[PDB]
Ligand binder design. Sequence first.
Ligand code: ICS
Ligand code: ICS
Ligand code: CLF
Ligand code: CLF
Ligand SMILES: [Fe+2]
Ligand SMILES: [Fe+2]
Lengths: 517, 495, 458, 458
Amino acid sequence: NLKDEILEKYIPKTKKTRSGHIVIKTEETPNPEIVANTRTVPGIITARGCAYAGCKGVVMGPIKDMVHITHGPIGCSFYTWGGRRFKSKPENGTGLNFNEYVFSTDMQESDIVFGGVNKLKDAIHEAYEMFHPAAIGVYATCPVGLIGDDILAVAATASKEIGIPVHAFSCEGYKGVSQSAGHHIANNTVMTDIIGKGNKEQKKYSINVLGEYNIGGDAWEMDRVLEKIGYHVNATLTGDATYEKVQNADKADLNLVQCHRSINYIAEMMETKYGIPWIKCNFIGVDGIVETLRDMAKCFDDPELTKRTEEVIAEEIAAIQDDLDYFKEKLQGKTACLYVGGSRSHTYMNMLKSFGVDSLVAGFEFAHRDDYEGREVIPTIKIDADSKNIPEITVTPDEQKYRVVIPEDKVEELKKAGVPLSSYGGMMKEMHDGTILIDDMNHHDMEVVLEKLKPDMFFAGIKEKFVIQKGGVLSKQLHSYDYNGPYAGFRGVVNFGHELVNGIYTPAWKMITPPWK
Amino acid sequence: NLKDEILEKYIPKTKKTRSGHIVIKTEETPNPEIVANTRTVPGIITARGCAYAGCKGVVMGPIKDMVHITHGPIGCSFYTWGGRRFKSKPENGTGLNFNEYVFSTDMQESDIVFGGVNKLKDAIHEAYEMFHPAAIGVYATCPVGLIGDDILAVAATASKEIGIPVHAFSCEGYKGVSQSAGHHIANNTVMTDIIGKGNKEQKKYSINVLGEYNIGGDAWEMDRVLEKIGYHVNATLTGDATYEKVQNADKADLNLVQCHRSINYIAEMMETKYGIPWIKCNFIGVDGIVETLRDMAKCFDDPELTKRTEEVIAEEIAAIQDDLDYFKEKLQGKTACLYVGGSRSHTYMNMLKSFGVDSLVAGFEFAHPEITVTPDEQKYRVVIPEDKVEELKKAGVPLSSYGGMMKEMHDGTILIDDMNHHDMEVVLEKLKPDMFFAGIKEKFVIQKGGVLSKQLHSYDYNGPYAGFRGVVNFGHELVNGIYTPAWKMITPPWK
Amino acid sequence: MLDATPKEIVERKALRINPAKTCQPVGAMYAALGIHNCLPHSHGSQGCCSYHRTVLSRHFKEPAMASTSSFTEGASVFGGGSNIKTAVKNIFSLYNPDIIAVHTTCLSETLGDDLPTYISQMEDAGSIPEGKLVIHTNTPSYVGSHVTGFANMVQGIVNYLSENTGAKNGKINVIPGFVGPADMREIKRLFEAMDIPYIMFPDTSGVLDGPTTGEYKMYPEGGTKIEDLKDTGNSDLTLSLGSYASDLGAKTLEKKCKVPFKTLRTPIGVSATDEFIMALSEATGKEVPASIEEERGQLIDLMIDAQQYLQGKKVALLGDPDEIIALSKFIIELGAIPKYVVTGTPGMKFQKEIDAMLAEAGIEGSKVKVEGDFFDVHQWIKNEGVDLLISNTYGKFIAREENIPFVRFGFPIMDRYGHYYNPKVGYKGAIRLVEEITNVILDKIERECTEEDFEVVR
Amino acid sequence: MLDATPKEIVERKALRINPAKTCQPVGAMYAALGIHNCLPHSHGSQGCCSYHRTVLSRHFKEPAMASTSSFTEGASVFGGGSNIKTAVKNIFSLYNPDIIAVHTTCLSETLGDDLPTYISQMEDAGSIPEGKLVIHTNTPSYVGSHVTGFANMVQGIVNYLSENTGAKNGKINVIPGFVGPADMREIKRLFEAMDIPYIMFPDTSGVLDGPTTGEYKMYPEGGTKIEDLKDTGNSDLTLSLGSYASDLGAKTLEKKCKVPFKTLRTPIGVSATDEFIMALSEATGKEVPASIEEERGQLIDLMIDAQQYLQGKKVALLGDPDEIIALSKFIIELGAIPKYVVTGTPGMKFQKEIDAMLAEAGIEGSKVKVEGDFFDVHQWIKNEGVDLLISNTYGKFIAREENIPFVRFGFPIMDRYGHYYNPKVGYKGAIRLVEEITNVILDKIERECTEEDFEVVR
Ligand code: ICS
Ligand code: ICS
Ligand code: CLF
Ligand code: CLF
Ligand SMILES: [Fe+2]
Ligand SMILES: [Fe+2]
């Protein structure tokens, strides 16, 4: 039993706390309760990051015409300099794009001892005068609250003087237990202070793609197919986004939720405030893409859209079918494990299974219980001491802007037809019986999985890649895509398969043992 | 003295033959008899090349829209593949340019034993069908005569079948004693079979520049200055030349002779045959350039051209004067030796002297069928009337003659014909010059000894060195060489 | 590419853009990986550890292990004592290093965590098993840079480990500074060629430049052994290579164990490698062998052979102070001109050493800036151009936007493979640098010349 | 650039364009400079000697001394006998080498000059002083290539010098083939690391890659010593590296002195280096040391780390047969495809060996040509493009015209500095090759990507 083998070496106190983070999906219990979103055990060798990474590095950073100022010492800024591969182009070929810069206050000892607010004020004004961006962001780091800096007040004072928005984010690294806290902090300010501040007129067949960051061009590949079918992509939060598009996010009829973990707060709040319903978007792998596009067609219920949907699916599949056949011939019968942050595990497992590759273990950094088991468990969840501090925002319907987008009659018929409107059943729902899931996976856990299962491949991140490969096992990166992509969309399935087959069949794997041994 | 230090180690027979090749040029004998143009002593480590290099590599190869086929084994072709830096651009942006290619019959054993004429014929036809050039050249190498190949006949038969000129050159490597024999071989065929076959209209103030190969862009720099003043450069033989411009070389009023050694046969035959006079062209260094320009002005005797000449000279010199003063400040007081092929020794010495650098030894590799022409009936003409020639000479313009390189050098200069490694090393050890200009075979030998050696053939992959802008390029590269910090870091600190 | 960078320079005193430094902790993490069987430990919030491990893997294309105390809001109120005691219990049992090397973050420093107290409480409770070790240093990110962090960790090693026991080892200590594993290997090779016994610490060769053998080893073969780190107090002399990275440790060892020390420039180029060789010879009376003298002569030969492409070339350099000081001197020795010279690491020494060598060479008009950044240099370049740029990966943007020949140097280099096998120090390393420099200069000349200026020989 | 090359192909059987070989004699001159205190001697018209010296200087940026018989038109009638006798008198008196190594040109070969007679007459006449030697080979330029010239001079060395005196030396002879001095250095370093006594010949290390010391030495410190060349007949075994350059000498030594031989590939890449190391181990019973094992594992680590940029890349290679055979194998070992593979040197072995490895890897659709030239490869590329070109300097025209990442390899390389200090053989050389390949591939990607596809990590 793999769970027992993983847990055995832990000291008693640690074994007791970790046991609940490992589950097995079975026919007897297909939706097992998992312990998730708790603090990391000190010293156990995690892959988790911090709330500032979640807020600045993940959600906010990709807004290309907003200057993002890290208020902290220099490292917080340096380690967000191009490592995460959100792609940006200047809007209409001419707009501002700050992707190639990182901005900070470069806190020194004097700022720690006497407060940093004067330096932050000067930095905001310098950014404004040098770049005239659409908006400025100020992001807290570890020292900021402790040394007494009120960034909310510095930001509001600056905004009044310079005449553009300045948004403060209290995303100190130690808040919460992972990147997740950072997502939540970002969602709160984007919702209250940016979304709905615009005045543009809504177009027909308008959708948003929420929780999509255009890593390696993913969003542009999504948009290619969505625009061919006939939709207007109003806003992507926040991959390749301008500030003004986020401000106009309320101008849509349907919200596609790609990353539930990072953007669910905004999805719920837009539904409450504006009446806009959402559906889960699964744009990795042929099965998920097609289901997503069919679900969308049924929400809009337009005979034309529907016919175009089928024509485009058929033509995109036909163009890649020879590649798909190749992948399966080259890979079928191989086994994998995967390690993600907070999302995507089932879609990658499904894409891999379309190539004949079975996935045995799915590890996670920081997914919540609602991500594993579904939102239906949100009533039963109780926030522990380490995450109870993160504000929970409440919105009310906008009397003037609210609209019933899909009448309750049609909502009822859609759910009967299998369309999960404004709900999400969780990652495990879809996984095959026997799948083992590990929450907050660590180095020890990963090494037991490698030694006992001997998978042909283990997909992970940059910290684990070379660890796995030193042992002779292929490890393709699921975050950076090893500096390629897209991996999303129809063309992404081909990019992923091509790079995977190239990896598996690299000749050096068989040359590791020298001939004198 | 130096001559005797150089001669000392030679065995008796070699000592006797080499003695005549080293002279000390002084005020007692302003131009002592030097022995030149004799066979190289076997085993003495010469720098000289062969007649094929002189014919194909030097004079003919720069003709850019002619396919030059080497008839021989592969090396002769391989060693003429871009090492000599004649520059070419396609004519009017569109014409043919074969500078990046070398062409050969790649002789094999069966060609040596049974003859190679059949392979040469097929190679000629393949080049014609593939490239449709203006002409094709066929150049002999060491084995060609010996194995019995008649390349003249093969060329003639192929020219008749394909309908373009095919020129055969019997430039087997062992002919003569140096590249010089190759120059002569090329000149004969260029004169008799190419020059004068054109029918373009002659323009006003037309000149040709002869014996100028556009090494590192030299010819383009000299054209810039000449065309500014107002001359029409009819033809350059053969730097950046098309076949057709060579065919129309007779459409000019004056021949400038840059390299007299390589092109004098053509200069003398064009005067005899077309009545076009020539003067020596010395387009290296400010003094040479300005003297050349003032002599050309005197020959045309046109008051506006004369005035523009002086206006151009003054502004060209004004534009570089600050560079020239800098070179003198940084170099004056230093000493040089030079080692050239066949030409240019005095112009470089003069340019070096304008920077305050004194030249002690000038070495040479080799400076010194016989055809006869007669006046073309339909084309001869007196360009400069009988005693207008006299007026020009009594006023210091040597019209259609050359004094020699030695007559113009300062007293004391020692000169060494067919200088060899032994000689060079004696000079370096006894005179300890700050710099020793030479070629690629010598450069690293000299620089291993802590002495700067800038190349006078390849220009160390820069240029131009001719013309006004050339003086600046040369001085800039020279100063950069002398002041390279590593020269003073050769000895490690634990010594 | 970098569209927002104005050409006209407006005064900038608060907004830092595109830094030419990172924070202390990764420098200490790197030093700790230079100890055999050591787990580096980041005492703070886990975001730091993940980011610091990450950059090391991006640079070296290798694993980079480290643990963290994982501070939450609880530790932010009550301090991190309980977190680090929990960590140490889990570390020894799960992962069994021989030594845990603890550094701190801006968080634990702002809080004033008392590591010496937590460590003696751990000793008392028996949390540190027999024969295991826990050491620490303090590495506040709002002071200095990653170089400072490396320096502080080296001091930590001597504070806790070095002991003079009377038993002279006949060895020279060498602290190689903030340099890569290939440089440590080259420095060792030269000690071995002179026949001089030594202890190098830290030493990341065989740790961050390791082979693939088909078996992953959490603690790779390399790294200085604990027993030899203890023995550094019995050596005859300490050579401190690079004052910013190495002096603190060398001075600490002198105070603690009476080992004298000598400060040397990082041995990049002719004079700085010569000074290192002369120091080894003077300290031991050993002769310089023919092999080393031949390499030097080959470097000189190359410098002269390639001289035309180097003389008067204007160079922009950004990086860490020890390395950029030595490399600036080499640029002058090559006949080229350090035109714009910047480090993000604070300190007077850099400004003084660069100014001095520039004056010696007669060079006026250069700009030298301490705590400058890539944005500074880019603005300077728009005003007056250069012929060559040398920096870490982050110079690639300037290089592309301004069409400048670019040589990757220093830390981090995340976009080319094998640099961690290539020395840049010694005569061997200097040869590599000249090859790279002339290669990119020549590549540019050939990309841009007209076809009629095309050349077979150069 | 190269606008006159047609895309559509008409078969050429007579006109050779842009050759992938040169003639024998330079190969013989190179082998001769691999003998200590040897002056190479060209028996023919002086133009050859000048051209052959010149290319070696352009390639090595070093002196390349040689003398010549300086045939004139007279020799075309009465032979070169008198010229060489006169040459020898001048050479010994002026330049005083310890050995004169004579080779021939197409002119002397066409004339049928009889070197053994001239040499025995000089012997009888007393023109060769006590303790001095004159040796010769025959090097007809209309046969084979410069590689054949090298092979022939090696046979000449054996014919004249190798002697079995019954006194076993316990050494292995290694003939390294037509490779550069840095390759000779690396091969020797590996013998030394294995602790295996050896004699290498020829050996141009210390002759064509030497230091500047301030004094010119006509005969550099390097080269195999005459006394060791004689002693080759007392060795236990000869390793012949690269059949084209080295088998003739090794077989001649077996027939003359009873030294058995083994033929190995030039040790470029994984399998070829492994084969060399296993041959050394098997012949001596010596264990392979940790240092060599670590180097190999670093190469493997690199090949895996950089794998995404190599897999399926189409490569065009031109050059000399022993090198291109082993390099094609390495290209396959990297996961790449030898798409177009050409040598100008004749012989069946090239065709067989390449065909065989392509078939083993399942690669079809490649074109392999013996006695092909650069014009051939250019035409093929115009019909179906490639991702990478590897060749000598003359590939640079195709590289620029077709925009192809370009790696300089082989002979001659006349337009970059330092290559003669960079090994391409062994695990160390393979690392340098992988660095160069992946650098040029990456540089092109970055040069041509749009700004929004611009990347910090690769
Ligand atoms: S936001 Fe999240 S760790 Fe949902 S913090 Fe992380 S660009 Fe991962 S699994 Mo990096 S919850 Fe996005 C993620 Fe997933 S940075 Fe990216 S790949 S889909
Ligand atoms: S032709 Fe002659 S050797 Fe006058 S064979 Fe030689 S391009 Fe020299 S001194 Mo190379 S008589 Fe020209 C020459 Fe002078 S090839 Fe050039 S530089 S001015
Ligand atoms: S958990 Fe997160 S990344 Fe860490 S500090 Fe805290 S907000 Fe920032 Fe910042 S400067 Fe360096 S990298 Fe840290 S030690 Fe401080
Ligand atoms: S002196 Fe001159 S260059 Fe020499 S061969 Fe004779 S014409 Fe030619 Fe040719 S193929 Fe090679 S390089 Fe010679 S040995 Fe023959
Ligand atoms: Fe690696
Ligand atoms: Fe050299």
